[PDB]
Design a protein around this ligand. Sequence first.
Ligand SMILES: Nc1ncnc2c1ncn2[C@@H]1O[C@H](COP(=O)(O)OP(=O)(O)OP(=O)(O)O)[C@@H](O)[C@H]1O
Ligand SMILES: Nc1ncnc2c1ncn2[C@@H]1O[C@H](COP(=O)(O)OP(=O)(O)OP(=O)(O)O)[C@@H](O)[C@H]1O
Ligand SMILES: Nc1ncnc2c1ncn2[C@@H]1O[C@H](COP(=O)(O)OP(=O)(O)OP(=O)(O)O)[C@@H](O)[C@H]1O
Ligand SMILES: [Mg+2]
Ligand SMILES: [Mg+2]
Ligand SMILES: [Mg+2]
Lengths: 475, 483, 128, 469, 120, 120, 53
Amino acid sequence: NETGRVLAVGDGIARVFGLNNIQAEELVEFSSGVKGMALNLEPGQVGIVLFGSDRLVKEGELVKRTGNIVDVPVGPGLLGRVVDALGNPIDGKGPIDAAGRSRAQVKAPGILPRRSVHEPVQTGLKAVDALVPIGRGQRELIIGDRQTGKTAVALDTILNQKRWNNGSDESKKLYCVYVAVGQKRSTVAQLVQTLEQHDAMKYSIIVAATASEAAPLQYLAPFTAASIGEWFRDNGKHALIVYDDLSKQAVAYRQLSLLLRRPPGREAYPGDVFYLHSRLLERAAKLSEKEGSGSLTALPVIETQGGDVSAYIPTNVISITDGQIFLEAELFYKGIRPAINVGLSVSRVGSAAQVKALKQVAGSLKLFLAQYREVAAFDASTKQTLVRGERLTQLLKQNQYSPLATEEQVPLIYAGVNGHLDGIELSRIGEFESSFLSYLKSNHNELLTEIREKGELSKELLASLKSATESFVAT
Amino acid sequence: LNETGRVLAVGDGIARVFGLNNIQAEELVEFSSGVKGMALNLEPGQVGIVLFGSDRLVKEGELVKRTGNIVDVPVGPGLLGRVVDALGNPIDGKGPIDAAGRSRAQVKAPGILPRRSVHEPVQTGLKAVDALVPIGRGQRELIIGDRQTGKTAVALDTILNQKRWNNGSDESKKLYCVYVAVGQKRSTVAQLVQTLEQHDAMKYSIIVAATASEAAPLQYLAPFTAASIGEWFRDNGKHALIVYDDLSKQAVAYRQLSLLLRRPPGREAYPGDVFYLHSRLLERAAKLSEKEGSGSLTALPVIETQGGDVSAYIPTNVISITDGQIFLEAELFYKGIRPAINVGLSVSRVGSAAQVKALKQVAGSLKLFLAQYREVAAFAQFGSDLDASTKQTLVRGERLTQLLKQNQYSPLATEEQVPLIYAGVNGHLDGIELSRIGEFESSFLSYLKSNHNELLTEIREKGELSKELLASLKSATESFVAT
Amino acid sequence: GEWFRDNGKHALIVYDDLSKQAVAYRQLSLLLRRPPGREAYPGDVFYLHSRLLERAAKLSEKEGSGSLTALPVIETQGGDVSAYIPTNVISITDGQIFLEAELFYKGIRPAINVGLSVSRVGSAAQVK
Amino acid sequence: TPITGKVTAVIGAIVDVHFEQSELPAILNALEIKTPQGKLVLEVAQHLGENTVRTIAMDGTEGLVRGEKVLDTGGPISVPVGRETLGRIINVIGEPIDERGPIKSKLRKPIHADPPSFAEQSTSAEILETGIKVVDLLAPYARGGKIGLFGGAGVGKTVFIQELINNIAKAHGGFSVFTGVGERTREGNDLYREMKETGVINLEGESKVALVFGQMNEPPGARARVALTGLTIAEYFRDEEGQDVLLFIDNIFRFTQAGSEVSALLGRIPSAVGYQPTLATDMGLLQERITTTKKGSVTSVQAVYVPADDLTDPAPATTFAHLDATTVLSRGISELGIYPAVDPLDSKSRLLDAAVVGQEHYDVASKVQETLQTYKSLQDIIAILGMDELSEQDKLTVERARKIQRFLSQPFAVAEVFTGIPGKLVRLKDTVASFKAVLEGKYDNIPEHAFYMVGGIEDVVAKAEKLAA
Amino acid sequence: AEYFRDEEGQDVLLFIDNIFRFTQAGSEVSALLGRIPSAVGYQPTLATDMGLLQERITTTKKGSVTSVQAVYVPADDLTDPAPATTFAHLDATTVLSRGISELGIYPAVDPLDSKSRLLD
Amino acid sequence: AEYFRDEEGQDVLLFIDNIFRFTQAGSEVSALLGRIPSAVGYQPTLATDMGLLQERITTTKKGSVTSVQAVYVPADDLTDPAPATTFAHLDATTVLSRGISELGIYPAVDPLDSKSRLLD
Amino acid sequence: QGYAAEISARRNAMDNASKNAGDMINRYSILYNRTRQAVITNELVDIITGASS
Ligand SMILES: Nc1ncnc2c1ncn2[C@@H]1O[C@H](COP(=O)(O)OP(=O)(O)OP(=O)(O)O)[C@@H](O)[C@H]1O
Ligand SMILES: Nc1ncnc2c1ncn2[C@@H]1O[C@H](COP(=O)(O)OP(=O)(O)OP(=O)(O)O)[C@@H](O)[C@H]1O
Ligand SMILES: Nc1ncnc2c1ncn2[C@@H]1O[C@H](COP(=O)(O)OP(=O)(O)OP(=O)(O)O)[C@@H](O)[C@H]1O
Ligand SMILES: [Mg+2]
Ligand SMILES: [Mg+2]
Ligand SMILES: [Mg+2]
C-alpha cells in the first residue's frame, strides 16, 4: 500500500502505480537512490518528475515515499558553503548543519504584516547608489544582454557588505545568497573562487543548480534558495538573494511543462509562467516590528536579446518587481561601465529609503542626467549644459571588485553636482576622483567621519564641503 | 428511451446527453430545470447540446426532453420599434410582440433564377460613400476597419438618413432597418436605442440585442434569426436593411462552441466551416424578381481587425464573401478625414449601377482625381518645385478630400451632395483657403436653399441632370464663388 | 544514376524540383499523423534531402573511376533564401546557381545573379 | 446531514471529487476540505459523470491526499456585504485579513449573479473632471461609466489610479470599493498605509472604502474569483444602499490570465495563443455586472495590463469593447521622459462629441489631435532626411506639435518623490484655454523647454520667465 | 467539358471562377474530416487535389480543352500556398492590379507581372 | 577526448564542426520522439542537451579538454535560439573574414570582432 | 562662392542622411528578425494544437 511500482518513465517524467497515501508534491525516492516530486496525481496513478537524470529509473522499480513535502535545511549552518537544490552539499567540506527544515513553497506574507521599506541596501556602485537606490525588502530587477556585466552589478553589491557583516552588531548586517541557474559550472567555480579570495564567503551562501542538472532541479532551485533566505528574514536578520538568472528558470520550466504536454502559450512559454516567477518574488518583503523585524531582498537577473525589454518574459518579470536597472549594451561597448541606462532604469520605492545624505547632495540628479541625454542627442547655454554632464558621466564609472563607502561617494557626487569639476580637464577626472578621496583621507578626514556617521550634511558641513572641494580644485 | 435522455456531463454551457434516439440535428431541447438548448454533436452513444443559458442549474442525471421543432423566430411588422433577444423574446419591457408569423433560423438563400440585378440605391447620406463607394438595394457591403474607427457610426448615419423617405407615403421607396448588436455591452444597446428614439428612427427600426452577457449560442443564432426577420419583409415585397455589429464578435462565440464541442480546430483555432457559416448568413441578401414583388434585403456586415491586417482568417473570408468593402483607418480619422474612408481599398462591385443617377454624372472623374492625388501625396514632401500640372493635382486633391468631411449623425440628402461634388469637380472652389472649405460647404447649401430652391427641388424630383440644369447650377456656383 | 556511377560511367541527375518532393513527404507524414515540425514540414525533412543528395560522388580509381553529379532545383517564394527547405538544401549543397526575377525582367538571360551564385568546388575543374 | 465526497485527483489548482451517493453538488457550489492549515475552499466547475465533479482550489493544493473527505456547503461561494464591510480588508472567500476581528453583518451574498436586466439600464452624459490635462482635454470620463487604463509593464497604471483616487475620492459622498487582483502585495500594503493617513479609513471612527485583495502570490483559482468578490461587494451598495459607488479594479487582465492558467487543467482545447475558449463570455459574465442601472451609479476604473505591449493580443482586444472610454499608455512615451505617458492619439472616449463637451472644447481637441498626427506622420522623414528639408508651414506645425506634446505632461502628487516637483491639479476650462491659446500660435516664441511639466499655460509663462533669469 | 472533348471530339473553351475557392473548400472539408492542418491551415492534400483537378483539363490527341481560370489572391500575396500552387499548372498567368486601375488604366494588367510560355 | 584528459593527463583540443547541426539533429530526434516542438521549432530539450554536451569539457586534476566549436548562425541572427543557446557557454570567439585575407593578412583573424572573456 | 557652398553643404547633409538611413536599416533588420521568430512560433503552435486531439 505505502510503496508503489513504476509503470513508465521517460523525458524526466514517470508514472507510478500505488502510492495511495502520498501527499501532493511529496518526495518519492526510487530504488536507485534518485528522488522525485509527486507532481500529478490521478485515479490509479501518480505522475512524478525526476530531479535526477532519466537514466536512473526503470519500469518495475519499487518506489518509497519520503513523507514530507519538498523541503530544505535552513539556518546559519548553511552559511559559507555551496549547496545544490534539496540542500545537498557539494563543496566537499562535509555534511550540512541545519537549524531546521522548511517547505520550499511556503506562501508569501500577506498584506498586513509588511512594512514599507525604510533602510538602504548599500550598493558600492556610485550610479546605483545615487540614481536608483535599493531599499531593504525591495525587489529590483537587473536586465541586460550577454557579457554586459549583469553579474558584476550583483557581485559588487555582495562584496560591499564586507564592511558591515564584520561589524559589532546584527543591526546593519546583510547576509548574502547567490543562485546560479543553468550557468556553466566553471562559472560557478570561478565565482566562488572570487568570493573566497575576498572575505565574502564567510557570510554568504551559493546555490548552484548548474547546466547539467535535469530540468526539475533548475525549476526548483530558486524556491529552495528563497526558503533558505526566509529563515534569516523570519529570525530578524536581513538577507539579500540574487538570481543569475530567472530567464533560464523560465526556460527550464518551459522544457518541463512541454514534456508534460501542457499547452504551449505565448512565445511557446507555458501560460503558467507568470505564476512561477511571481510566487517566488513576492516572498521578498520587510516585516513590521509586530512579527519580528527583518527583510528578504531580491536581485533577479534577466538576459534580454538585442535590448528587447518588450519581449514576453522581460515585461512579465518587470510587472512583478519594484524597480529595474537596464544595462545598455551600447553604453558598455561605448566604454561607459557599468553602463546603467539612466533613462529607463527605475526604482519605485528606493527614493523613500535612500541614505539621506546621498539624496541631500544628489538633488534630483536623475532628471538632470536625463536632461543631459536629451541634450547629447544633437543656444550657447544649451551647449554649456553638456559639459557638466560629460564630467558626471566620466565620474560615475567604477571598476569591478572595488566598492566605495558612502563617505567616499558623497564628496564625489557633491563635487559633480555643484559643478566644481566643470573646470577640470575631462580626461583627468579618473585621476581627480582617486586623488580627492586621498585628500579627504589626509586632511579633512573628520568631515568624512561626520558624513558617514550622521547620515546628513549639516548646513555647516555643506559649506565646509563646498570649501574643501573648491580648495582641492584650486590645487 | 427514444424521446427522452439523461445528462451524462455538463460544463461551460455544453452538456453531453444519453439517449434521444429520435432527435434531429440542430433540434431544440428542454432541460427539466427550465433551460433550453440546441443539439450540435451526434455520436453513436451521445448527443452534444449547447445551452441557451447558464448551466449553474443543470446537473448530471437531469432528464432532457425533445421539442421536435427546429430553432425559429417570430416575424412581422410588430417587431418595429422593439428590442428582442436572439430568439425573438422581448427585452425592452414595452410589452408583447405582435408577431405576424414564424420562420426557422436556417433557411435556403434564394436561388439563381428568382433574382434580378441591383438597380436601386440605398442613399446613405454619408457623402463620401455615396460619391465614391455606392451601395445598392440587395447589395452586401462590408464595413471593415480598426478598433474604434467609426464602423458603428457609419451604419448609424446610414440608418438615420432613411427618415426622409420612411416618413412619406412612397411605399416603394421605404427602407425598414434591422440592427443586430452582438458581443456589444448591454448599456451600448441602451444608448443606441435612446439615440434612435431621440431622432424618431425607432418607428422603422428593429433591434436584436444578443449582447456579451448572453450565453455563446444565442450570439451564434442572433444574426440568423435576424435574417429570418428581414426576409419576411423581402418575401412580403418590401425593402429592409440589416446591419450586423459585428460578425467577428460572433465568430469568436462560434469558436468557443466548436472548441468545447471538440470539433477539430482550423487555422487560428477557428472551426473549419466559418466560411460556410458566413456564406449561409450573407447570401440571403437579394433583390427578388418582379414575380415576387421586387422586394429586397440589404446587408452591412461589420468586421473589426487588429492593427489593420486583413490577413486574418475571418476578415479574409468576409472580404471574399461580400460584394464590396469600406475600409476605415485610424490614420485618416486622426489627420482630419472623417468618416475616415480609405478610398483606394474600398471597391464596390455594383458601382455606378447603384447610384441615384443624378450623382453619377456630377461625380464623374472624381475617383480619377483622388486616385491621382494619392500617387503624388508622398512625393510632395521632397520639396521640389514641381510642375504646374502636378501642382494643380496636388493643390486640388487635398482641398477636395477636405470636402468629404462630415459631422456625425448629420446625413445629407443627395440634393445637397450634388452641388458640393459639382463645385469640387469643376474646381470652382480651387481658390478658397483650405480652412474655409468647411465654411463654404456649410454656406453653399444655404445659398441654394435660399435663392435656387426650384433647382434643388428638381434635383430631387427629376433625379437626373440636363445641360440646362447643369448650366443653371453653373450660374449659381459662379455667382456664389464671388461671395 | 548509381548504376552508371558504380559501373564506371559518368552520370548527371537533375531534380525538378525538390521543393515539391518535400511537399509530398509532408503530405505523407501528416496523413500518417506523424509529428509535425517547423513550417508544417515533418521534423526530419533535412534527412529526406540529405539521404538523397549525398549520393552525388566521384569514386576513386581504386574503387573504379565514376561520378554522379546532381543539380537540385528549388522554387523560392519571394526570393526568401532563408525559407526552411531552401535553407536545408543550401546547407547540404556545395554551391548555388541563383536566378533572380529582377534580372530576368531586366533582360539578363539566363538571369544568373553573379554576386549570390558561388561554386566552391567547381573552380578546381573549369577547363584549363 | 451535510453531504460528503472523496478526493480522487489533484493537479495544480484543480481537484476531482467523487460522491458515493447519488446526491450531487450543483455547479459553482462551495466545498470545504478540512486541513490543519485551515479549511480549503473549492468551487465546482464541471460534472464529468459517474457522480464525479471537477473543481478549482483556492489555496495551495499541497498536502492534499487522495481519499480526503470533502464537505458541501449547500450553496455558492459567498461574502459579507453592507456598510460593515467598510474600513476592512476582505479575502476572496470572505475572511478578513486585517486582523481587526470577524466581520459580521445582516447579510451575505453569493459570488455569482446574473448581470442587470436591460430594462433597468441607465445612461447619462455627466462629464467627470479628473484634473489631468490630457484626459480632460482629449478623452473625458463619464459619471457611472466604465473607463480603462491600458498599458505595458511598468508604464504608470497604478500611480495613475492612485492619482485618480487622490483627485476624486476625497469627499465623493458615496462609498468606494478597491479590488486588488494579481497586483503587488506591496501595492496593497502601501495603499492601505496611505489611506489610513488621509482619512479614507479609520480604525476608530467611520470609513468610506472597502478593500478586497487577492494579490499575485495567490494561486490562480483565487485570482479568478477575487474580482467577482469585489464586484459582489460593489453591487450591494448599488442596489441596496442606493449610493454612487467608486469602483477601482487593478489588475483586471490577471482575471482572464488566471482563467488561462486553469484552462489547460480543466481540459479545454486551447484557443489562439493559449487563451481560454471561454475568453469572450467568461469576460462578459464579469464585465456586464458593472454597468450603472436606474437604481444607482457605479463609476468604475479598470487597470488593463498588456502582455508584451501587444494590443493585438486577444485579451486587451476583447477588453476594449466592454468600456466607454480608454486611456492608452505606451512605452515609447515613457522612454522619451514624458509622463503620465498618455498616448494622445489612441486614447478615446464616448463623450468627445460636440453635443456634450462644448463646441469650443471639441474643436480644440480635434485640432490638437490633428497636429500630433501630423508630427507622427512626419517623424520618419525627419529622422532619415533631416528636419532642414521640411516645408515652412510643416516645420512650424512640427515645432508647435512638439510644444503641445511636452505640454501634455503633468506631475502628480503621487509622483512627488519621483519628479521632485510638487503635484498640481488643473481646472478643465483652464486646459481648454491653454491648448486653444497654443494652437492660436501665441506662444511659438517661448522655448520648448518651458512647457515641460507645469499645470497650465500661466505656469508655462512663469517657468519661461524663471528659465530666462 | 470532358464529354464534349472525348466523345464529340469538339474543342472546348472552359471557364472557371473561382479556383482559389476550390482550394478553400478543400481546406474546409479536410479540416472537418479531422486531418492535421498543413502550413497556414490549407489541407495536406492540396498539391495532389489541385493536380487531380488541373490535369483532367489537359488536351489529348482527340480534341483540345482551352481553359481560363480565376484565382482570388488573399491580401494580394501571390506567394500564399493556395495561389502559389497553381503557378505549376498554367501556360500563361495574368496578374491584375487595382493600382493600375487607380491610374485610370483598364483592364489593369500588370504588364511586367504576366508570364506566357508561348511568347517565343 | 575525455579519456586522454583523465587517464593519460595531457591537455586536449576537441574540434566540433558544426555545433548548429548538433542542435538540428537534437531537434529532429526530439520531434521524432513526439516531444511537442518549442519556440521557433527547436526541441524543448535544447538547453539541457547543450548542457550535457558542453558541461563535460572542463579542467580537472590531470588536465583539460579545450574545444574549438564552429558556429553556423541561422539567418545570420544572433538572437535565434540555436546560436543564442550556444553563446551562453562560449568562453571566447574568433572571427575569420575573407576581406581580411584579401588585405594580405594571414591568418585572416579579425582583430576587433574577435572577443575573449579572458582579456582580463 | 554660393554655388560651392551649396555643393559642400549638400555633401555633408546627405552623408548624415545616409548615416541615419543605415541606423534605421539596422533597427528594422533586428525588428524583422524578432517578427520572424514570433511568426514561426505562432504558426507552429496552430499545427501543434490541431495535432494534439
Ligand atoms: N566595473 C567594471 N568595469 C569594467 N569592466 C567590467 C566591470 N564589471 C565587469 N566588467 C567586465 O565584465 C566581465 C564580467 O561580466 P559579467 O559576468 O558580469 O557579465 P554578464 O552579463 O553577467 O554575463 P553572462 O551572461 O556571461 O553571465 C569582467 O570580466 C570584465 O570583463
Ligand atoms: N463623423 C464623425 N465625426 C467625428 N467623430 C466621429 C464621427 N464618427 C464617429 N466619431 C467618433 O468616433 C468614435 C466612433 O465610435 P464607434 O462606436 O462608432 O466605433 P467602432 O469602430 O464601431 O468601435 P467598436 O469596435 O468598439 O464597436 C466615437 O468617438 C464617435 O464619437
Ligand atoms: N507621471 C509620472 N511621474 C513620475 N513617474 C512616473 C509617472 N508615471 C509613471 N512613473 C514612474 O513609472 C513607474 C510607475 O509605477 P507603477 O506602479 O504605477 O507602474 P505600473 O505601470 O502600474 O506597473 P505594472 O505593470 O507592474 O503594474 C514608477 O517608476 C514611477 O516612478
Ligand atoms: Mg552572469
Ligand atoms: Mg462599434
Ligand atoms: Mg500596476
